[PDB]
Curated annotation (Swiss-Prot):
Protein name: Galectin-8
Domain notes: Contains two homologous but distinct carbohydrate-binding domains.
Natural source organism: Homo sapiens (Human)
Tissue expression summary: Ubiquitous. Selective expression by prostate carcinomas versus normal prostate and benign prostatic hypertrophy.
Gene (name only): LGALS8
Domain Galectin: 17-150
Subcellular location as annotated: Cytoplasmic vesicle; Cytoplasm, Cytosol
Site features described as Critical for binding to sialylated and sulfated oligosaccharides, chain residue numbers: 57
Known partners and oligomeric status: Homodimer. Interacts with CALCOCO2/NDP52. Interacts with PDPN; the interaction is glycosylation-dependent; may participate in connection of the lymphatic endothelium to the surrounding extracellular matrix.
């Protein structure tokens, strides 16, 4: 699966980052996030959100949260009407402190498919319609090299 036609590319964004996604996340669209975690980082998160409201809090369709303590994990969840759901934890994680990642989030009709550095990482079934997603948030101790979208 190819990373062709990446557009609206932002390099070295300031973190915390909150940015409007330039087009609708229809099936087969990609979000590509490249970066690395510093040596003192314990976690970071990527949030695909319905808007950028703070109070009331924006719904988070997809919360993708690598954690680095010990052998590490990835926590995924959704926030609806200011309440987190039950998390889905993935223990087979490719993330390491000081190791770079290319996170590819592919939106399908029924789920997100996430790959890191060209290798499948996890699936996450939609709990909110992906058509409602228009905002990308990135928070925590993380150095983001680039953010890009594939709509074409």
């Amino acid at each position: 699966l190819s990373l062709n036609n990446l557009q609206n590319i932002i390099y070295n964004p300031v973190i915390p980052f909150v940015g409007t996604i330039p087009d609708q996340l229809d099936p087969g669209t990609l979000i590509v996030i490249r970066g690395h975690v510093p040596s003192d980082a314990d976690r970071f998160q990527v949030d695909l959100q319905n808007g950028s409201s703070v109070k009331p809090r924006a719904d988070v369709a997809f919360h993708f949260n690598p954690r680095f303590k010990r052998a590490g994990c990835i926590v995924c969840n959704t926030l609806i009407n200011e309440k987190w759901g039950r998390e889905e934890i993935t223990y087979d994680t490719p993330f390491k402190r000081e190791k770079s990642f290319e996170i590819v989030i592919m939106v399908l009709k029924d789920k997100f498919q996430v790959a890191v550095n060209g290798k499948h990482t996890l699936l996450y079934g939609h709990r909110i319609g992906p058509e409602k997603i228009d905002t990308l948030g990135i928070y925590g101790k993380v150095n983001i090299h680039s953010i890009g979208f594939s709509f074409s």
